[PDB]
């Protein structure tokens, strides 16, 4: 008797289908909350060899040729289209939210230059690394827009929202910034100390986002959070 | 719409009847917090229209009145959120990434106008086009931003990080690449070739990427 009450599952499909008989006043509800989203790998012709410990966020459509190191994260909503030119990510490079680490085809003169990002590279939220190489242990800024062929030297932070023009590879430690490609200052050594600290803390923080890959049973068992 | 509201009501009763009129028998499948952004072409009384040869990425939402033509593409993460007035995206355009095309609703402070994106427009990443009558074969740069009523005329290669101002009818072929909108240089012809060829580049790259599948082995793994 119970489990034969699947008739109410079939009855629901009727009243649910009744959305078709009710989408007539205008063309309504072409969305159906579908299932397919070729996102988390979306291999075009080359596959990412991302590690078993490099947390990528299921929103992050890491397309094509990509490689991430042990401990580095690929945070929420960051597309990495390594489709036309190779990409890579060192161990500890936390490419933060809303990134655009999609490389190039060309821009007005050749400049293939596969984006390679070293270790401990704390990249900021909403960063746009369109076609630059980035060196180890630097801290790109939340909102930065790193254009073609901009070798961001080591331990040189790019400012928040700091667009960097083409070819203007910043020096080491020289904090850049500004809508035009101009330097700002050489801050301090505590700056690099905090760079490394934030890099390792973001690494273990991404290691704390293991709940993102939990199983249905584990999600509903976390739903015990009410009791505690 | 009234009957749309009534349809929302019959569907809820129906979903509910399944959720706990038959998932009552040992089934917690409904309770799984599955995503809902996969409604790429989110709808209203006005709906988003998209032709065949127009790749839409599944990481990208296309909300509001949209008219994606031929060759146009909406790549991974973009949001053509245009509820108020139609996002009349033309043909062969190339949004290319986490961009945004808004007629997003305000308190009619500037009378938000439709965003008639032109043809072969290879908009770059993070561009935040907002009430933009951007014309055809135009380039907008990475991380860029635009403002209400802008008219990026033919071949107007807006540069990276740029912030075009309100109602600025940028001239045809003038490069404006700054936070205060500012003409910089008459564009060269090699840039014209690049912008007119990157159009078909992505047009092909978007007809590629061939999502159109399913990966059950991964589904079976994530099941356990």
């Amino acid at each position: 008797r119970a489990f034969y009450s699947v008739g109410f599952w079939i009855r629901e499909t009727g009243q649910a289908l009744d959305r078709l008989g009710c989408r007539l006043q205008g063309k309504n509800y072409f969305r159906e909350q579908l299932s397919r989203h070729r996102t988390l790998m979306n291999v075009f012709d080359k596959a990412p060899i991302v590690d078993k410990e490099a947390f990528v966020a299921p929103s992050a459509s890491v397309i094509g040729d990509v490689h991430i190191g042990r401990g580095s994260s690929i945070w929420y909503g960051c597309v990495l289209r390594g489709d036309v030119n190779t990409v890579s990510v060192g161990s500890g490079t936390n490419i933060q939210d809303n990134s655009l680490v999609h490389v190039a085809k060309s821009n007005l003169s050749g400049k293939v230059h596969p984006t390679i990002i070293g270790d401990n590279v704390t990249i900021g939220h909403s960063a746009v690394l369109h076609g630059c190489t980035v060196e180890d242990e630097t801290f790109i800024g939340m909102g930065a827009t790193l254009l073609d062929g901009v070798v961001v030297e080591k331990h040189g932070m790019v400012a928040a929202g700091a667009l960097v023009r083409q070819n203007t590879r910043i020096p080491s430690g020289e904090v850049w910034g500004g809508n035009p490609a101009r330097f700002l200052r050489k801050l301090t050594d505590e700056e690099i100390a905090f760079i490394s600290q934030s890099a390792t803390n973001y690494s273990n923080l991404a290691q704390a986002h293991a709940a993102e890959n939990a199983k249905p049973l584990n999600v509903i068992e976390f739903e015990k959070v009410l009791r505690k | 719409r009234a009957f749309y509201s009534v349809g929302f009501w019959i569907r809820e009763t129906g979903q509910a009847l399944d959720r706990l009129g038959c998932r009552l028998q040992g089934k917690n499948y409904f309770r799984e917090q599955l995503s809902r952004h996969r409604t790429l072409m989110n709808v209203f009384d006005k709906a988003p229209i998209v032709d065949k040869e127009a790749f839409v990425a599944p990481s990208a939402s296309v909300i509001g009145d949209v008219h994606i033509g031929r060759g146009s593409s909406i790549w991974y993460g973009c949001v053509l959120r245009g509820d108020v007035n139609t996002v009349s995206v033309g043909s062969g355009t190339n949004i290319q990434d986490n961009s945004l095309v808004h007629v997003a609703k305000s308190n009619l402070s500037g009378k938000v106008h439709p965003t008639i994106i032109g043809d072969n427009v290879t908009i770059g990443h993070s561009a935040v086009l907002h009430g933009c009558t951007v014309e055809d074969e135009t380039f907008i740069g990475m991380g860029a931003t635009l403002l209400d009523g802008v008219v990026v005329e033919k071949h107007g290669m807006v540069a990276a990080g740029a912030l075009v101002r309100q109602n600025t009818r940028i001239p045809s072929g003038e490069v404006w690449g700054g936070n205060p909108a500012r003409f910089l240089r008459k564009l060269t012809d090699e840039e014209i070739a690049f912008i007119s060829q990157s159009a078909t580049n992505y047009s092909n790259l978007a007809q590629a990427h061939a999502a159109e599948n399913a990966k059950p082995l991964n589904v079976i793994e994530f099941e356990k």
């Binding site: 119970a2 489990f3 | 009552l24 040992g26």
Partner: peptide, 27 residues
Amino acid sequence: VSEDKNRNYAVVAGVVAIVGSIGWYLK
């Protein structure tokens, strides 16, 4: 094609309620 005890009892009792009440507002 089965369930757990102490819940099918509850569904049978809920059916008993609505069937019983129907009979009540019916009489």
